[model samples]
Target chain A: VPEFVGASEIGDTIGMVIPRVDQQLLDKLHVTKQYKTLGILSDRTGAGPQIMAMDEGIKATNMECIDVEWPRDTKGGGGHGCLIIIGGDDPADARQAIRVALDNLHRTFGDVYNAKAGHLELQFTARAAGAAHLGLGAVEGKAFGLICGCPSGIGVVMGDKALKTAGVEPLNFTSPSHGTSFSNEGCLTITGDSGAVRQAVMAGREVGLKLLSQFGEEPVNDFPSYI
Target chain B: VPEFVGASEIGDTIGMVIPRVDQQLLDKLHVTKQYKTLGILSDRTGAGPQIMAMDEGIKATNMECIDVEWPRDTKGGGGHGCLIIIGGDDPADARQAIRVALDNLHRTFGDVYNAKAGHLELQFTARAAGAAHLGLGAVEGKAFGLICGCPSGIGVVMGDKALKTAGVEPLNFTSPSHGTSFSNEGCLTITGDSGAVRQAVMAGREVGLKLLSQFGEEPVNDFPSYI
Candidate 1:
């Protein structure tokens, strides 16, 4: 018989109310975990409502979605995590696709039973399916790459290069007859349990500090050379 | 043998210049004796240059022009007097006419002169003869007669009566026109000789004050009404 042991609970669940679930709101909630989200979404047609519901569930459950882009320093651009959604061929297929994507998130960031640290709330719509899926894939790739470096805390990158390097998988859900096309493209959200969430947030901070460090400790000035 | 005083001046020698003139500039000079006017008028076909030169001479000689309409309370309605040309049938005749006018002015106000008194600068033109002489006479007829019992400055009747009663003969140069019309017709000029000039300015101020006084003192509003 397998050993029976209770899962460790590291953080308290929080309730978040998002009157309207837009991309920005999703990004804010991504770095948090152990939360229940209530989303009042506008789009109800196609797989819009279901996609938002699924995104919220994934965030509340501390799952990771893929495909995130981070800006670079030479360009003087850098920021934190964002939420992106990847979609399926049809409404029903889209729900299945999100579930699979969430499964992938669990694989990357451990299972919900094991996730007991942080909390977050997120929501999205599949009206723009292709774009949403790409965004999600990008966020996932970014998260993986960031974990390799900082391994903790909220990690953010500047510019599209860092995001592209994250290895966003192409959205698999598409009609057989027509070729894969881009749809609802937007930000990506990721949340984690207690320990994992803390680590992710710290990783983001560490990345920011490292980027700032490239300048140097002293300030630059010009003076006596003219004299 | 008649007693002939040595170097006793008998006849007045009159020098006249009639240049082109404008009614408005003349009116301004008449009202404001403070302004020193210098005109550059060409001795062209018309009497324009002579009239302007006379105006300059009046200023150069420190002569004043009085506004017959006197008080300039209302915006544009006012009378003016300045030595102006009366270009007649002949230039010589115009000169004589101007001479007569000047002699008449001197005779009328000669007693009011002092060493510090301003001198008269005269200009004569023949063209202004007709309207100035004829029109003002008919207008002042009955109006002049109605000033029997009215006191000085009481009403228009009194002023007209005083002029008549005082044996003040209107100049043959202009008709007995209304003050405004008289000026408009270019009938006369009151040069700024010290005494005459002072009298004219005082008269204008008196008119202004009289008009203002007609409104009477405002009622003092104390606690009387409230009590």
Candidate 2:
């Protein structure tokens, strides 16, 4: 097809994939529980067994796991891995799993990446109707968008269709809805379930961009392990 | 904990999620298929059947389905959707699925995005491992690295030494190794099986950059689908 090329700066994406959630899934959707997703990116080592530690911890707390990203290979194994857990029983129930996964990691492999230790604690939810899942948990609900932090001009479109949806309006849209939020937009705060934040972006093809990398001006006070 | 934040551009990714892909799955691994993922960003509508239309086409040809992105929400569904299929029977088999997916879109929705009536045809692949897969497919056997493409750095250090070990230089990496190649760097080419190609992507996480997003100045007349 001596055809053409791309649209944006996807220059660095290897395999950007999105799960196929049924389009009509909304019809059979229900919000039975609210869970928070604990995403921890850390430097740990020790394979197989360590992988199980996180699961056991989730089971112990009666929480379920969404998934875990172990090091791509056992080479450095835990050195670079990510873990996501969903807790429906209690909003706080997720904390236990987070604590377990992180602590287990600390025991086996101390800060290998020198990442200043970060955790992406976001709400995890699911929309299902009689066993049929509509979308992901609320974490992926269309009406509920969340942006942990972002650069100026980019994260602004991160929200409910308050001004765009024909006759519809944002249902109590605010930044705080996403939890105590922060931003690279120079220490900003927002409220609500739909993160109607703002940022100026170009005609590029990056869904999300990491223009700035930070640990936030704040500290990890609510991070269960510390609490 | 009041909490700290993330390290990269993850903030713009509102409600982004990947279906849980069994995490404890390094035990039974094999790269039976050396797959090349073609991520198509297109403009198409008439969901439901159109979505299944893709699956039917792939299955009909005997190739397996990795997954599909059938419009996130009608809001901008067809406007930006992606499809990925894995073919082990032959690289040509993978081409069949890509052709089928694109053709179906044309049947339903005319070139709406004016994307040059385009679908970003990328040769998602990578560099790594020996026949033993001290790295993967051997590890995943089934699941392995699918680099959308690569170059320069970051991805270069994507692997390391640990439980299992190996020391070798890069087969010298590139993105479209096995498929009909393209380049953003210089006109390049290679023959292969599967690759764990690496680069020095920033601490900022992102794999397979746009080294192949542009033209190589040189061309091939045998790009399966193109031919």
Candidate 3:
């Protein structure tokens, strides 16, 4: 028997390039566009990584993010992984976009050892690409705060605190229904100046951590403290 | 750091009883109806378990399945767990419903240790309760087969094969869109006589395994052969 113990299951991180986008695959991915080159970035982490990477990937390349399956949206492999599909005319650009997305995921949440457990305090700052794709109604080229937390009850409080503390414009809020990791977290996205976005994220994080810690059970040993 | 190796994280299995669910919690859980007692059954296994248990719990006792958050629907805590909410006039009934759900989960999938990674061969037989709650048009008191698998591309083939092999009436098929595990699986529910349901499930399993093995990668050492 292969050792289930002592072996770390591969944390989700992968990139794929479909040179010719198949119609069937497009239908399954819920996209109608017939872009030639398709790029896919996926990981078992929560939507936090996918959203952050998606923003960076779109800004860093000339690819159109055709579709996004937020974490647990597919409900395929058990619902933790998120898929960000990018389409481009050139295969090289598709590949580059996928690479950039992977890089951003590594840079931000890569330090997290256990990607399976939802991080209680999560935030990402992104430009309009992500907001526009997600229909957040943020101004073009504006920075936005993507703040999310688990135990969604805590998320509501944190979202309120963040909004009240900063001059940011609230773009969107979703509680488990729209997207979270597989664990039923909630999200609040806000648009503002970079500084305001940063402040909002920070304020949200502060209150989220406190509420989760106070109300939520202690994390298992070695699990992320934020959880 | 605590040992991330060897020690398996607790696979999802738990029951909780709330004598009275608070208003805020009810809102978060999305239940507008006021019920005196609330019971919750949850596991990291997948929607298969929840669906199965929901049917059994509702039938075995007098309880209303208030709401169900299929695997990864919550997207909290990294999105693998599923929650089936039950409500009753009496706390005893609520507790009984939860116990029954947990028992059914233990009986069907308890042998499988890794609840996080979904099982490719999965089927649950249920009656009207599951169908009614899910809005599937299966007849009342009818036995239905809920067959689900990961790498949903294969699921399509299996679903087709199962339908042709038996006299089961097709009820529903969802591909990672409505509900799968967090891993992007698909589901096919069929209704018929018990024998027909059994035959259909068996046929679907046979083809699902074959297609998955032929087209999908070999499972890592010690992992379930079906994956």
Better of 2 and 3 by DockQ: 3
Any idea what lDDT model 3 has?
0.56
**Candidate with better DockQ, 1 vs 3:** 3
State the lDDT of candidate 3 residue by residue for A1-227, as single tens digits. Answer: 01000111223444556656434334444543658677655444445555566677778888886655543542332224555557788777777776676666544553222223334545445556742455333455777666666556766887888898879888788776564434456678788788878888778877765665564444222322221
TM-score of chain A for the candidates in order shown: 0.22, 0.26, 0.76
- TM per candidate comes to 0.17, 0.22, 0.52
For residues A10-61, could you state the per-residue lDDT of candidate 2 as single tens digits?
A: 1110111112223454234332333332222132222222333344345446
lDDT of 1 by residue, A67-90 (tens): 223211101101112233322223
Q: What is the DockQ of each candidate?
A: 0.00, 0.02, 0.08
lDDT of 3 by residue, B106-198 (tens): 444522222243335455454567424553334567776656554443454456557767777776766543444444554577788878887
- Residue B202 of candidate 3: its Cα lDDT? 75
User: How big is the positional error of residue B190 in model 3, measured in Å on the Cα after superposition?
Assistant: 15
Model 1 residue B129 lDDT?
23
The DockQ-based order of candidates, best leading, equals 3, 2, 1
